[PDB]
Motif scaffolding. Structure first.
Motif, PDB file in Angstrom:
ATOM      1  N   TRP A  47       0.824  -1.207   0.000  1.00 28.99           N
ATOM      2  CA  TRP A  47       0.000   0.000   0.000  1.00 28.99           C
ATOM      3  C   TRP A  47       0.860   1.260   0.000  1.00 28.99           C
ATOM      4  O   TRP A  47       2.064   1.208   0.251  1.00 28.99           O
ATOM      5  N   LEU A 105      -5.271  -1.528   7.122  1.00 33.49           N
ATOM      6  CA  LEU A 105      -5.863  -0.831   5.989  1.00 33.49           C
ATOM      7  C   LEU A 105      -6.665   0.374   6.468  1.00 33.49           C
ATOM      8  O   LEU A 105      -6.396   1.499   6.062  1.00 33.49           O
ATOM      9  N   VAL A 115      -8.121   4.931  -3.843  1.00 31.26           N
ATOM     10  CA  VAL A 115      -7.202   3.824  -3.595  1.00 31.26           C
ATOM     11  C   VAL A 115      -6.989   2.988  -4.860  1.00 31.26           C
ATOM     12  O   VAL A 115      -7.876   2.900  -5.712  1.00 31.26           O
ATOM     13  N   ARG A 170      -6.244  -0.761  -6.298  1.00 33.23           N
ATOM     14  CA  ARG A 170      -6.256  -2.191  -6.003  1.00 33.23           C
ATOM     15  C   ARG A 170      -6.027  -3.011  -7.271  1.00 33.23           C
ATOM     16  O   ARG A 170      -6.474  -2.632  -8.354  1.00 33.23           O
ATOM     17  N   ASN A 171      -5.334  -4.142  -7.123  1.00 34.92           N
ATOM     18  CA  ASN A 171      -5.051  -5.028  -8.257  1.00 34.92           C
ATOM     19  C   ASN A 171      -6.327  -5.694  -8.790  1.00 34.92           C
ATOM     20  O   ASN A 171      -6.318  -6.275  -9.879  1.00 34.92           O
ATOM     21  N   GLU A 205      -8.551  -7.451  -6.338  1.00 30.05           N
ATOM     22  CA  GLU A 205      -8.850  -8.536  -5.413  1.00 30.05           C
ATOM     23  C   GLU A 205      -9.862  -8.089  -4.363  1.00 30.05           C
ATOM     24  O   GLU A 205     -10.113  -6.891  -4.195  1.00 30.05           O
ATOM     25  N   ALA A 235     -11.271  -6.954  -1.015  1.00 32.96           N
ATOM     26  CA  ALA A 235     -10.732  -6.219   0.127  1.00 32.96           C
ATOM     27  C   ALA A 235     -10.923  -7.006   1.423  1.00 32.96           C
ATOM     28  O   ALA A 235     -11.984  -6.945   2.049  1.00 32.96           O
ATOM     29  N   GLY A 252      -3.132 -10.794  -0.744  1.00 32.34           N
ATOM     30  CA  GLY A 252      -2.941  -9.446  -1.255  1.00 32.34           C
ATOM     31  C   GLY A 252      -4.023  -8.488  -0.792  1.00 32.34           C
ATOM     32  O   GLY A 252      -5.112  -8.914  -0.405  1.00 32.34           O
ATOM     33  N   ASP A 253      -3.720  -7.189  -0.828  1.00 35.57           N
ATOM     34  CA  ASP A 253      -4.673  -6.169  -0.406  1.00 35.57           C
ATOM     35  C   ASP A 253      -4.904  -5.139  -1.507  1.00 35.57           C
ATOM     36  O   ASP A 253      -5.934  -5.158  -2.181  1.00 35.57           O
ATOM     37  N   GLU A 254      -3.941  -4.237  -1.679  1.00 37.08           N
ATOM     38  CA  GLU A 254      -4.034  -3.193  -2.694  1.00 37.08           C
ATOM     39  C   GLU A 254      -2.657  -2.874  -3.280  1.00 37.08           C
ATOM     40  O   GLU A 254      -1.716  -3.660  -3.137  1.00 37.08           O
ATOM     41  N   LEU A 255      -2.544  -1.720  -3.937  1.00 34.19           N
ATOM     42  CA  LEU A 255      -1.288  -1.292  -4.541  1.00 34.19           C
ATOM     43  C   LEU A 255      -0.839   0.045  -3.950  1.00 34.19           C
ATOM     44  O   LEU A 255       0.332   0.219  -3.606  1.00 34.19           O
ATOM     45  N   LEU A 283      -2.595   4.066  -1.997  1.00 34.96           N
ATOM     46  CA  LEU A 283      -3.721   4.790  -1.416  1.00 34.96           C
ATOM     47  C   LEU A 283      -3.373   6.267  -1.231  1.00 34.96           C
ATOM     48  O   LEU A 283      -2.397   6.607  -0.559  1.00 34.96           O
TER      49      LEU A 283
END
Length: 87
Positions: free
Chosen positions: A3, A32, A59, A61-62, A64, A66, A75-78, A80
């Motif tokens: 993130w 997060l 934000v 995100r790839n 996926e 949350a 995984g979560d995000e890329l 924010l």
């Protein structure tokens, strides 16, 4: 599993962008929401106050789901960062 953050919250914490590698008590959403803009990320003391009614936060995100209560997620995000135009 990573993130990014703006100075909005990094002002107090000092850390904006982070990556997930180790597994522990810290959940995927637990950090997060905090990193997003919970309070501890930038202390509870608002100091002056900005407002309480509506807030915008962008934000990346790839694509996926949350996850929050699953520190062992895939995984979560890329990144924010909150909206800002004009200066």
């Amino acid at each position: 599993m990573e993130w990014k953050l703006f100075a909005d919250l990094a002002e107090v914490a000092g850390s904006r962008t982070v990556r997930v590698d180790v597994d522990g008590d810290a959940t995927v959403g637990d950090a997060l929401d905090a990193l997003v803009g919970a309070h501890p990320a930038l202390e509870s003391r608002v100091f002056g106050d900005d407002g309480e009614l509506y807030d915008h936060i962008n934000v990346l995100r790839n694509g996926e789901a949350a996850a929050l209560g699953e520190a062992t997620a895939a995984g979560d995000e890329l990144a924010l960062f909150p909206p800002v135009s004009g200066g």
